[PDB]
Amino acid sequence: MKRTFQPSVLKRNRSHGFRARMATKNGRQVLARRRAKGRARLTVSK
Amino acid sequence: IREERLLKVLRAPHVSEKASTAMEKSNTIVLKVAKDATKAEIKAAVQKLFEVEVEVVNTLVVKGKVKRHGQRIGRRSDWKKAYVTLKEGQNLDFV
Amino acid sequence: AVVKCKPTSPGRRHVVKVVNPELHKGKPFAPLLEKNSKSGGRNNNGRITTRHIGGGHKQAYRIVDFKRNKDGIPAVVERLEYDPNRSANIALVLYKDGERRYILAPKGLKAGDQIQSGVDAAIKPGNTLPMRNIPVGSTVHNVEMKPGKGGQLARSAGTYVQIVARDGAYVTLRLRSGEMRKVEADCRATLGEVGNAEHMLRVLGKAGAARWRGVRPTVRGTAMNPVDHPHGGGEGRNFGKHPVTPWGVQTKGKKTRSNKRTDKFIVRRRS
RNA sequence: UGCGAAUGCUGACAUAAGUAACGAUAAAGCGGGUGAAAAGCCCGCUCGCCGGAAGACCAAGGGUUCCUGUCCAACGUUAAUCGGGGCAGGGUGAGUCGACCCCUAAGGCGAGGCCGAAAGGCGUAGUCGAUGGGAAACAGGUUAAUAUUCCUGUACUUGGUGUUACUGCGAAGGGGGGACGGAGAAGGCUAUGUUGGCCGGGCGACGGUUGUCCCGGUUUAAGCGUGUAGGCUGGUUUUCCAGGCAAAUCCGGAAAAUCAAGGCUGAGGCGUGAUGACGAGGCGCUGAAGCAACAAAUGCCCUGCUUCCAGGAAAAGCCUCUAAGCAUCAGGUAACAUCAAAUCGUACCCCAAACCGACACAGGUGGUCAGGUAGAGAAUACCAAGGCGCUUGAGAGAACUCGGGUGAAGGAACUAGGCAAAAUGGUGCCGUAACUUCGGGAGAAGGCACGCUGAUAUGUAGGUGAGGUCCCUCGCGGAUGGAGCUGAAAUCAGUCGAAGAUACCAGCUGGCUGCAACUGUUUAUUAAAAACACAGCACUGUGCAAACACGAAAGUGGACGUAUACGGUGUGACG
RNA sequence: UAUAGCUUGACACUGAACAUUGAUUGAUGUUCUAACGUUGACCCGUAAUCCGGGUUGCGGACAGUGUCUGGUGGGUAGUUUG
Ligand SMILES: [Mg+2]
Ligand SMILES: [Mg+2]
Ligand SMILES: [Mg+2]
Ligand SMILES: [Mg+2]
Ligand SMILES: [Mg+2]
Ligand SMILES: [Mg+2]
Ligand SMILES: [Mg+2]
Ligand SMILES: [Mg+2]
Ligand SMILES: [Mg+2]
Ligand SMILES: [Mg+2]
Ligand SMILES: [Mg+2]
Ligand SMILES: [Mg+2]
Ligand SMILES: [Mg+2]
Ligand SMILES: [Mg+2]
Ligand SMILES: [Mg+2]
Ligand SMILES: [Mg+2]
Ligand SMILES: [Mg+2]
Ligand SMILES: [Mg+2]
Ligand SMILES: [Mg+2]
Ligand SMILES: [Mg+2]
Ligand SMILES: [Mg+2]
Ligand SMILES: [Mg+2]
Ligand SMILES: [Mg+2]
Ligand SMILES: [Mg+2]
Ligand SMILES: [Mg+2]
Ligand SMILES: [Mg+2]
Ligand SMILES: [Mg+2]
Ligand SMILES: [Mg+2]
Ligand SMILES: [Mg+2]
Ligand SMILES: [Mg+2]
Ligand SMILES: [Mg+2]
Ligand SMILES: [Mg+2]
Ligand SMILES: [Mg+2]
Ligand SMILES: [Mg+2]
Ligand SMILES: [Mg+2]
Ligand SMILES: [Mg+2]
Ligand SMILES: [Mg+2]
Ligand SMILES: [Mg+2]
Ligand SMILES: [Mg+2]
Ligand SMILES: [Mg+2]
Ligand SMILES: [Mg+2]
Ligand SMILES: [Mg+2]
Ligand SMILES: [Mg+2]
Ligand SMILES: [Mg+2]
Ligand SMILES: [Mg+2]
Ligand SMILES: [Mg+2]
Ligand SMILES: [Mg+2]
Ligand SMILES: [Mg+2]
Ligand SMILES: [Mg+2]
Ligand SMILES: [Mg+2]
Ligand SMILES: [Mg+2]
Ligand SMILES: [Mg+2]
Ligand SMILES: [Mg+2]
Ligand SMILES: [Mg+2]
Ligand SMILES: [Mg+2]
Ligand SMILES: [Mg+2]
Ligand SMILES: [Mg+2]
Ligand SMILES: [Mg+2]
Ligand SMILES: [Mg+2]
Ligand SMILES: [Mg+2]
Ligand SMILES: [Mg+2]
Ligand SMILES: [Mg+2]
Ligand SMILES: [Mg+2]
Ligand SMILES: [Mg+2]
Ligand SMILES: [Mg+2]
Ligand SMILES: [Mg+2]
Ligand SMILES: [Mg+2]
Ligand SMILES: [Mg+2]
Ligand SMILES: [Mg+2]
Ligand SMILES: [Mg+2]
Ligand SMILES: [Mg+2]
Ligand SMILES: [Mg+2]
Ligand SMILES: [Mg+2]
Ligand SMILES: [Mg+2]
Ligand SMILES: [Mg+2]
Ligand SMILES: [Mg+2]
Ligand SMILES: [Mg+2]
Ligand SMILES: [Mg+2]
Ligand SMILES: [Mg+2]
Ligand SMILES: [Mg+2]
Ligand SMILES: [Mg+2]
Ligand SMILES: [Mg+2]
Ligand SMILES: [Mg+2]
Ligand SMILES: [Mg+2]
Ligand SMILES: [Mg+2]
Ligand SMILES: [Mg+2]
Ligand SMILES: [Mg+2]
Ligand SMILES: [Mg+2]
Ligand SMILES: [Mg+2]
Ligand SMILES: [Mg+2]
Ligand SMILES: [Mg+2]
Ligand SMILES: [Mg+2]
Ligand SMILES: [Mg+2]
Ligand SMILES: [Mg+2]
Ligand SMILES: [Mg+2]
Ligand SMILES: [Mg+2]
Ligand SMILES: [Mg+2]
Ligand SMILES: [Mg+2]
């Protein structure tokens, strides 16, 4: 049957993209936390 | 267009079976060009350097494949492929 | 006219509709409609501020003239039209200078009638003028509350207010709810009553009829759980508590009006 | 600092055990080839399955899985020479397809602004935001892999510039259009199919088959011209008023003069496109026929028409009118000639082994195409095009389990309970009770006929409809006319079988009674119900800056509503 | 046991003049504008249903807000119930 993950790139980028993170302050804090940990991938941008 | 710009747009002639078949049947040469080279500057650089009269230019961006050199996995860079169509009375000059 | 459907199917048994043959058929006037998007009972925050709203048919908004500021210009009723936004029907009127507008169709006004609005206008159904010039005891509708704000009182179908007294600058009106309210005499009104008085004799007949108008199902608080409604749940059918709204406030008789700004304008409460 | 325990943590290895299982019972057999090795690879002939799909093609999602060569280390639930596996190379060609771009919906952000301990919330002007509106291409050919992109032929759209001949052009403004609902139906059509003609080939391993016989084909687009079935709508003129903030020659209103027409839209048809392409076959060359009638779409006219209430986007492109400003200038118009149409995607899978399910998983996944025979039918059965035999096989034919078939006599005696099974099942006609809200109950119940052949009637009723004749500007015209094609149903007589709704498909029925009026909703994953909802009823609050609700507040919903309205509560048709 | 909300009074924003009236000081009522409200009208910023300013009109020391305060307050919260 229908599972919980329905892949859509538009919804993905509008929810978790880089510009979405930079738009809000908590998103910028998330990006800072990810840069501090040394994540090779900050967001879902491709 | 800048003369220094046309010198850098061309990369290399593309050797292949399809390219050779098009060269002797459609009178079209396949060339490796810069990724940012447009059709206008491609035609200008070809007419300036190869000394051939270009009819029309078709381009396409080839995506790089994933390979493995030893134990490391890499991704080859992308490159644009130009189908330069010369006029019927024009042959190609190799220099 | 009023007509009862035939009990062919179980949904048409109790349906009682009102079909007006004098209403215009076809698309309304083009340069008088506006985009009207449904809300669903949700405010700017997105939460449901008013329950039981949502769905229904699509509706274009008809710009209705409630102020009637075009004074000293005769107008002729072109045709009565249907309005889904209000319970009263509207009438497209044409002015002497070639201007079309929407007005609340009063009771009895048919196509081809002459209407005017102004201090110099005449006393007839559909004419607008300041309440200081309207004779006492007359039945008016689309009455303003401020001098130049537009008609707010008696705008539904079959509603009307009566001028019970005029003393100085204020005019005492008897509202449709039985209230006596003082209003500035400089405010305007329209003679007659609001048409479509047979609107209250209609019966939907089925839940689908209510769902077409944007009304959603109402769940009784007694059928909910204690966490959902103050009436809460229980073992079987138990109430055991005073009836209250779903926020703790006691309904069924408790007055909720608290407004000291407009008490001076209210003569006698309803009953 | 000492380990045997803490259902202790990590790694390795036993046990069950060479046991279950190898993932839909659609199915395989044989010959040849390669190969170390062949049930699984390729080729060939038979067999079986799907065929509103297990076929074809897109949008999402994935990203090289696409094609070629090579390898069988690991992966593939077996082997593997094979692969969506490893390695190398190749492959995606656009002014016309989509993105991009112009315009907006819901919604988002938001200069100033308001509000708020801060962080921030709302929001004007604006700017983003498709799932919507806006310019333009078709047919054939070609690769191992791309094609509406490459080639051939034949087209179309937009913009810049230059020249020639005319000319009031101009918006961040006004008007029109864009521009819009459900259901029903038939008038003409087309896609398409059947048959007849013609063309090419055959005269059949077994009784006949030179004919009313067998097989196959019988195709052709966009565009341009013509302007038809149909649909909508009176046209031109002049004087006036100024509603569209200013103006208007535009729209709006008024008055008279005039003509019986005018304009817009519009499938399909025909000519051209096309002396071409394609074309069964024959020898990379050539290549005949390529027509007619009938039937007919859910597709087109049709954004039509009728009807109904629940009353059914916006803006831009486009047309039109002028303000400021410019008057041999600019700008606009018509013709021609050149230039430009950039960038990005294009491979491949999308009823799946490639997306979502940890899997090469009996699940899910939006959109378009829609052949023949029966059939009302997109059901169903068998087939076409096309695609597959589902990645462990070979034997035997125990109990037992699973899915089915049949069954003497009896027929619910079983069981908590007719659970499950068995049974009915279609068309046409006849006929049909209590009760009833007069609509129903009802397909009540029940009964009769159904195949094939001949005649009525060498094919009737009906449908379509050619040639000829007459009429009129003279035509895609009207009357006539009926060839031809097509074509039910009924009766009569005969006939065959056990049986003619012969297969698949395809109501079991009646009586009493509780509950809920009913159609609907509900505990995704043990409860679908008497529970929830519901139309109806009553009470109650609210006079608008409404009550009420979300918000420290601003603000928003209520509602661009106004007591015949809105909110809350209880009950639940109707008598 | 508290608290959001609702609600009562006092003080501040919050004034003027008169009449009645309880004790130089309070309360009541009637008029007024100048505080303040205006989700009434027009104009400007401005080719803007936000906002600000101006004029006018209507309300008007009312409403409303701040501190303190009495009541109510399973709406919410923390707990007890040997
Ligand atoms: Mg080209
Ligand atoms: Mg390209
Ligand atoms: Mg790189
Ligand atoms: Mg509009
Ligand atoms: Mg609204
Ligand atoms: Mg309600
Ligand atoms: Mg409405
Ligand atoms: Mg209810
Ligand atoms: Mg109700
Ligand atoms: Mg419950
Ligand atoms: Mg419970
Ligand atoms: Mg409670
Ligand atoms: Mg009980
Ligand atoms: Mg009791
Ligand atoms: Mg140890
Ligand atoms: Mg121990
Ligand atoms: Mg254990
Ligand atoms: Mg064992
Ligand atoms: Mg065993
Ligand atoms: Mg076994
Ligand atoms: Mg098996
Ligand atoms: Mg199994
Ligand atoms: Mg060999
Ligand atoms: Mg073999
Ligand atoms: Mg096999
Ligand atoms: Mg084979
Ligand atoms: Mg089927
Ligand atoms: Mg395919
Ligand atoms: Mg993609
Ligand atoms: Mg993947
Ligand atoms: Mg790709
Ligand atoms: Mg790979
Ligand atoms: Mg492959
Ligand atoms: Mg081996
Ligand atoms: Mg293996
Ligand atoms: Mg390979
Ligand atoms: Mg491979
Ligand atoms: Mg396009
Ligand atoms: Mg918006
Ligand atoms: Mg914002
Ligand atoms: Mg700011
Ligand atoms: Mg935009
Ligand atoms: Mg779109
Ligand atoms: Mg392909
Ligand atoms: Mg406009
Ligand atoms: Mg329009
Ligand atoms: Mg639309
Ligand atoms: Mg429709
Ligand atoms: Mg046809
Ligand atoms: Mg022959
Ligand atoms: Mg023989
Ligand atoms: Mg034949
Ligand atoms: Mg006119
Ligand atoms: Mg209609
Ligand atoms: Mg109605
Ligand atoms: Mg001028
Ligand atoms: Mg492609
Ligand atoms: Mg493709
Ligand atoms: Mg699909
Ligand atoms: Mg599947
Ligand atoms: Mg998968
Ligand atoms: Mg498999
Ligand atoms: Mg699968
Ligand atoms: Mg079929
Ligand atoms: Mg058939
Ligand atoms: Mg059948
Ligand atoms: Mg089959
Ligand atoms: Mg086949
Ligand atoms: Mg397939
Ligand atoms: Mg298998
Ligand atoms: Mg057996
Ligand atoms: Mg069995
Ligand atoms: Mg059986
Ligand atoms: Mg038996
Ligand atoms: Mg028997
Ligand atoms: Mg029996
Ligand atoms: Mg029995
Ligand atoms: Mg028994
Ligand atoms: Mg027994
Ligand atoms: Mg059963
Ligand atoms: Mg059965
Ligand atoms: Mg029957
Ligand atoms: Mg019955
Ligand atoms: Mg026909
Ligand atoms: Mg017999
Ligand atoms: Mg059934
Ligand atoms: Mg009982
Ligand atoms: Mg029920
Ligand atoms: Mg039901
Ligand atoms: Mg359940
Ligand atoms: Mg329920
Ligand atoms: Mg507020
Ligand atoms: Mg509001
Ligand atoms: Mg109840
Ligand atoms: Mg009851
Ligand atoms: Mg304002
Ligand atoms: Mg408590
Ligand atoms: Mg504690």
Author numbering:
A (entry chain d): 1 to 46
B (entry chain U): 2 to 96
C (entry chain C): 2 to 272
Quote the original article.
In this study, we determined the cryo-electron microscopy (cryo-EM) structure of an E. coli 70S ribosome in complex with mRNA, a P-site tRNA and CDZ, resolved at 3.0 Å. Overall, the oxazolidinone moiety of CDZ binds to the same pocket and in a similar orientation as other oxazolidinone antibiotics, with the A- and B-rings forming the main interface next to the polypeptide exit tunnel at the PTC. The 2-oxazolidone A-ring is bound to the PTC pocket in a similar fashion as oxazolidinones, in the close vicinity of G2061, stacking against U2504 with its hydroxymethyl tail oriented towards A2503. However, in the other conformation, A2602 is “flipped-out”, thereby stacking on top of the fluoroquinolone moiety.
Due to this central role in protein synthesis ribosomes are frequently targeted by antibiotics that specifically inhibit bacterial translation by binding to the prokaryotic 70S but not eukaryotic 80S ribosomes. The molecule combines elements of an oxazolidinone with a fluoroquinolone moiety, resulting in unique biological and physicochemical properties.
